[PDB]
Design an enzyme around this catalytic site. Structure first.
Site, PDB file in Angstrom:
ATOM      1  N   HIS A  96       0.835  -1.239   0.000  1.00 45.19           N
ATOM      2  CA  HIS A  96       0.000   0.000   0.000  1.00 45.19           C
ATOM      3  C   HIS A  96       0.864   1.282   0.000  1.00 45.19           C
ATOM      4  O   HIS A  96       0.297   2.348  -0.203  1.00 45.19           O
ATOM      5  CB  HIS A  96      -1.060  -0.019   1.109  1.00 45.19           C
ATOM      6  CG  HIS A  96      -0.540   0.126   2.499  1.00 45.19           C
ATOM      7  ND1 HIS A  96      -0.514  -0.943   3.378  1.00 45.19           N
ATOM      8  CD2 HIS A  96      -0.098   1.203   3.192  1.00 45.19           C
ATOM      9  CE1 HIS A  96      -0.009  -0.543   4.537  1.00 45.19           C
ATOM     10  NE2 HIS A  96       0.238   0.779   4.453  1.00 45.19           N
ATOM     11  N   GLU A 151       0.696  -8.436   0.673  1.00 46.97           N
ATOM     12  CA  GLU A 151       0.902  -7.048   1.187  1.00 46.97           C
ATOM     13  C   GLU A 151       2.392  -6.719   1.340  1.00 46.97           C
ATOM     14  O   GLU A 151       2.679  -5.686   1.952  1.00 46.97           O
ATOM     15  CB  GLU A 151       0.146  -6.824   2.500  1.00 46.97           C
ATOM     16  CG  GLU A 151      -0.032  -5.346   2.864  1.00 46.97           C
ATOM     17  CD  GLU A 151      -0.663  -4.431   1.813  1.00 46.97           C
ATOM     18  OE1 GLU A 151      -1.377  -4.965   0.923  1.00 46.97           O
ATOM     19  OE2 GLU A 151      -0.436  -3.177   1.880  1.00 46.97           O
ATOM     20  N   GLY A 205       1.477   5.686  10.987  1.00 48.26           N
ATOM     21  CA  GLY A 205       2.908   6.029  11.085  1.00 48.26           C
ATOM     22  C   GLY A 205       3.800   4.821  11.366  1.00 48.26           C
ATOM     23  O   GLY A 205       5.028   4.946  11.245  1.00 48.26           O
ATOM     24  N   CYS A 225       3.341   1.625   9.928  1.00 46.37           N
ATOM     25  CA  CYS A 225       3.365   0.660   8.783  1.00 46.37           C
ATOM     26  C   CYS A 225       4.794   0.555   8.239  1.00 46.37           C
ATOM     27  O   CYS A 225       5.469   1.605   8.121  1.00 46.37           O
ATOM     28  CB  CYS A 225       2.379   1.035   7.687  1.00 46.37           C
ATOM     29  SG  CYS A 225       0.663   0.713   8.190  1.00 46.37           S
TER      30      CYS A 225
END
Length: 182
Positions: free
Chosen positions: A41, A72, A146, A148
């Site tokens: 992402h 992911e 903040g 990730c």
């Protein structure tokens, strides 16, 4: 503060950079040579900022399992003039649960941040921002924006990277040795 934080600190001090994309600032784990990982992402393009330096992306691959389900994890090869310490020997070989993990973050907003998250469950399937996702690890800590890309470790193992939360739990994508065979 103890031997879990010692292993985590050793990983942060040599194997992390601050990555910036159009989607924000991320902790980014360097694994070997010029190869790093980041949450998919982050939407990595042809150019990324690495510790505030404009850097060409030589290759980027959004991993999916053999059912064509999102993992992911994006593997990025950076046009960088320096290699990472090789930490592939700290990656697990199989899906597993863990005791007593630490989540470590280093950004402009959250420098030198270390969180004892406790027990890590092999959660498996998660609907992450509306995307079916596999190989998710879960810990019962109220993780926030903040964090990730944050590195999840036990003593002796780098097990995952933080990719989301629901306000009460946090979720990491597994890192496996087989992702980084050259």
């Amino acid at each position: 503060m103890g031997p879990g934080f010692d292993f985590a600190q050793a990983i942060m001090k040599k194997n992390t950079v601050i990555a910036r994309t159009e989607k924000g600032e991320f902790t980014m784990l360097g694994v070997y040579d010029r190869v790093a990982v980041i949450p998919t992402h982050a939407s990595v393009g042809e150019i990324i900022y690495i510790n505030d330096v404009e850097t060409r992306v030589l290759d980027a691959c959004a991993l999916r399992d053999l059912t064509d389900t999102n993992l992911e994890i994006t593997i990025v090869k950076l046009d960088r003039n320096q290699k990472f310490r090789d930490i592939r020997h700290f990656l697990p070989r199989c899906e597993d649960d863990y005791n007593d993990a630490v989540l470590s973050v280093h950004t402009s907003k959250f420098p030198n941040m270390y969180i004892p998250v406790g027990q890590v469950t092999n959660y498996g399937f998660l609907n992450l921002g509306g995307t079916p996702t596999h190989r998710i690890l879960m810990y019962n800590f109220p993780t926030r924006a903040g964090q990730c890309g944050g590195v999840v470790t036990t003593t002796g193992k780098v097990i995952g990277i933080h990719v989301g939360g629901n306000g009460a739990q946090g979720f990491a994508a597994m890192l496996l040795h087989s992702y980084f065979t050259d």
